[PDB]
Amino acid sequence: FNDIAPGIPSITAYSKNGLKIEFTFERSNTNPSVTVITIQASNSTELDMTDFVFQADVPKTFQLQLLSPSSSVVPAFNTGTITQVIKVLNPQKQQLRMRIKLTYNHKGSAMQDLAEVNNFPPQSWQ
Ligand SMILES: [Cl-]
Numbered sequence: 375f376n377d378i379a380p381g382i383p384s385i386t387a388y389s390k391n392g393l394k395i396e397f398t399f400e401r402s403n404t405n406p407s408v409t410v411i412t413i414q415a416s417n418s419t420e421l422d423m424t425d426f427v428f429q430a431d432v433p434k435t436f437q438l439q440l441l442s443p444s445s446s447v448v449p450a451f452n453t454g455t456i457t458q459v460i461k462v463l464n465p466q467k468q469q470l471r472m473r474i475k476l477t478y479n480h481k482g483s484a485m486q487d488l489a490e491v492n493n494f495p496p497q498s499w500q
Contacts, residue, residue: 382497392419399498407465409498415456417448426478428458433471437463470499
């Protein structure tokens with residue numbers, strides 16, 4: 375008797391100042407080196423986060439494809455999310471590593487953060 379979801383476990387990649395970014399993963403059925411990550415950004419605060427831009431880097435052996443995001447606004451009070459697809463190419467199947475760069479306005483400040491994603495599960499690259 376085991377209760378874990380079948381497939382690639384989801385993670386909270388970042389959570390700070392009321393911004394929360396979740397990652398869910400889909401391994402391609404046809405291409406063992408391709409992993410599709412859908413990001414959901416949420417805002418648990420009382421003010422909207424505007425002009426949201428999610429960017430990311432991977433190591434040189436990898437390749438990245440960022441598709442366009444559903445929106446620029448992370449609504450206040452958790453009334454919606456921003457969705458963005460990113461595809462990761464890992465031809466050598468090495469340990470997945472990602473640095474994210476976030477940029478947005480909130481509470482009358484231009485917000486910046488740069489942070490490493492530390493909790494990729496082994497099934498997102500193995
Ligand atoms: Cl987590």
